[PDB]
């Protein structure tokens, strides 16, 4: 709650001394779709709904 600086410890269960580990911060991937509406095009590439 205070942040990582206040408690900069990662407690891993068991004895992991001498083991190589990979630490990172989760990447928040976001993609919001456009609303699933009917799409039409004219003779050219112009779109319409």
């Amino acid at each position: 709650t205070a942040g990582w600086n206040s408690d900069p410890w990662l407690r891993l269960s068991g004895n992991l001394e001498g083991r190589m580990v990979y630490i990172g911060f989760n990447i928040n991937f976001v993609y919001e779709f456009s609303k699933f509406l009917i799409k039409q095009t004219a003779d050219d590439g112009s779109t319409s709904t």
Binding site: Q40, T41, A42, D44, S46, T47, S48
Partner: peptide
């Protein structure tokens, strides 16, 4: 099934 709107890119200015 009722007909769809014709896709009109149309334009501007004087016609």
């Amino acid at each position: 099934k009722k007909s769809l709107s014709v896709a009109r890119s149309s334009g501007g200015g004087i016609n």
